[PDB]
Amino acid sequence: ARVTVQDAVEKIGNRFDLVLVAARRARQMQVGGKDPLVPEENDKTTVIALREIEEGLINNQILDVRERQEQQEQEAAEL
Amino acid sequence: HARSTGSYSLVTQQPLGGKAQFGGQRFGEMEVWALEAYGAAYTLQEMLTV
Amino acid sequence: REEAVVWDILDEVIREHPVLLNRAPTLHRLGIQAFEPVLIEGKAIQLHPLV
Amino acid sequence: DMNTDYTLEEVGKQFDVTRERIRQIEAKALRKLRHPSRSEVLRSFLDD
DNA sequence: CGCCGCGTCAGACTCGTAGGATTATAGCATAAAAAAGATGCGAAAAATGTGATCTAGATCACATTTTAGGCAAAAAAG
DNA sequence: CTTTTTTGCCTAAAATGTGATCTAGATCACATTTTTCGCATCTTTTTTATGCTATAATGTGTGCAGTCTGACGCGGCG
């Protein structure tokens, strides 16, 4: 997955989509501090973004669902 | 030469040139046309502005 | 001071931190590229020759 | 933490007219602080 | 209509190298405005001075009590 | 049997313990003389805005460009 960004575009369909959503996710990981799912293996967040996108775990859709559910529950618990 | 961060211009606040004064490296605009053909809007933004 | 940890950390960071590459004239799109870093004991960038 | 400069008598009325026991409390605060308690983090700014 | 004169305005990119300017041109006098002190005003605020409140160790001839070991003789070893 | 080593005694002797009873120390919130400071005067002191000088004097160029050039506009230019 390191030198090759190939599988990520046959999964999604676009370079631009994978780059954008990956920068999003690993910004929520770089500064937000959420955990990974696939093992870490001592490499900067870029690899883990690419890998998580490569297996069928994260995508803009699933990011939307996760942030939706957690924020809705946040609004709920605030009251 | 390398240039991390240092002096800037005065009218334009822009990094300078020349290793003698710790010069940033200019990019011609055709280097920009490159990522026009790639589409790197955020790197574009970066190197334009900040 | 040049502590060894400086370099240990630097190798630690430089991992997976990609970089750009520019010759002039950047006439067409491929007159610049983007590679992964690897460090060297000298003031002389190496590169893959074929390009 | 203000745009202000308060040093004297106004304080005397807001809190206590006493003025030079405040000086004694300057000596206090140095003693509370200077004796190596929190000096070490200042001394990195000593080179400033 | 089909010229003619004339003018306008473009001339591939990212680096490096040196410091650097010159001519001549009137004179005096006045009254005004703004710059360095002294003075001074000895003022605001650090020192000094009010007297009554408190307190932890300090004492000497006793009574033990340890030290204190100097001798000599009792006991242990040569 | 003689030596020495030990302890206990003699014999002289320092160290321990009574606490009761003061006494010089230090506190302690608040008024006074000194620093020498800051803005208004003077007060010079320098500097600066302004004002005249009565033989006589009457049209530049001033140092350069080396003239790019091909196409197209546009005013003419007929």
Curated annotation (Swiss-Prot), chain A:
Listed EC numbers: 2.7.7.6
Molecular function GO terms recorded: DNA binding; DNA-directed RNA polymerase activity
For this protein, the record's InterPro entries field holds: DNA-dir_RNA_pol_omega, Pol_omega/Rpo6/RPB6, RPB6/omega-like_sf
Identification of the protein by name: DNA-directed RNA polymerase subunit omega
State the source organism's domain of life.
Bacteria
This protein's species is Escherichia coli O45:K1 (strain S88 / ExPEC)
GO cellular-component terms in the record?
DNA-directed RNA polymerase complex
Question: Which EC class is this protein assigned?
Answer: transferase
**Function statement:** Promotes RNA polymerase assembly. Latches the N- and C-terminal regions of the beta' subunit thereby facilitating its interaction with the beta and alpha subunits.
Swiss-Prot record, chain B:
* Subunit-structure text: The RNAP catalytic core consists of 2 alpha, 1 beta, 1 beta' and 1 omega subunit. When a sigma factor is associated with the core the holoenzyme is formed, which can initiate transcription.
State the protein's purpose: DNA-dependent RNA polymerase catalyzes the transcription of DNA into RNA using the four ribonucleoside triphosphates as substrates.
Question: Which family does the similarity line name?
Answer: Belongs to the RNA polymerase beta chain family.
Name the chain's protein.
Answer: DNA-directed RNA polymerase subunit beta
Q: Which organism is it from?
A: Escherichia coli O45:K1 (strain S88 / ExPEC)
Origin organism lineage: Bacteria, Pseudomonadati, Pseudomonadota, Gammaproteobacteria, Enterobacterales
Provide the gene name from the record: rpoB
Swiss-Prot record, chain C:
Q: Which domain of life is it from?
A: Bacteria
**Transmembrane ranges?**
none
List the signal peptide residues: none
Protein task: DNA-dependent RNA polymerase catalyzes the transcription of DNA into RNA using the four ribonucleoside triphosphates as substrates.
- Subunit structure comment from the entry: The RNAP catalytic core consists of 2 alpha, 1 beta, 1 beta' and 1 omega subunit. When a sigma factor is associated with the core the holoenzyme is formed, which can initiate transcription.
Return the similarity comment: Belongs to the RNA polymerase beta' chain family.
Its recorded name reads: DNA-directed RNA polymerase subunit beta'
> Which source organism?
Escherichia coli O157:H7
Location of this fragment in the whole protein: 403 to 453 of 1407
UniProtKB/Swiss-Prot annotation, chain D:
Where is the secretion signal located?
none
- Name the family: Belongs to the sigma-70 factor family. RpoD/SigA subfamily.
**Portion of the full sequence shown:** 566 to 613 of 613
Taxonomic lineage of the native organism: Bacteria, Pseudomonadati, Pseudomonadota, Gammaproteobacteria, Enterobacterales
The organism of origin for this protein? Escherichia coli (strain K12)
Complex and partners: Interacts transiently with the RNA polymerase catalytic core formed by RpoA, RpoB, RpoC and RpoZ (2 alpha, 1 beta, 1 beta' and 1 omega subunit) to form the RNA polymerase holoenzyme that can initiate transcription. Identified in a complex containing RpoD, the RNA polymerase subunits RpoA, RpoB and RpoZ, CRP and DNA. Interacts with Rsd; this prevents interaction with the RNA polymerase catalytic core and with promoter DNA, and as a consequence, promotes transcription from promoters that require alternative sigma factors.
Q: Could you tell me what this protein is called?
A: RNA polymerase sigma factor RpoD
> What subcellular compartments does it reside in?
Cytoplasm
Report the function annotation for this chain.
Sigma factors are initiation factors that promote the attachment of RNA polymerase to specific initiation sites and are then released. This sigma factor is the primary sigma factor during exponential growth. Preferentially transcribes genes associated with fast growth, such as ribosomal operons, other protein-synthesis related genes, rRNA- and tRNA-encoding genes and prfB.
Q: From the UniProt record, report the name of the gene that encodes this protein.
A: rpoD
> Where do the record's region annotations for Interaction with anti-sigma factors lie?
19-34
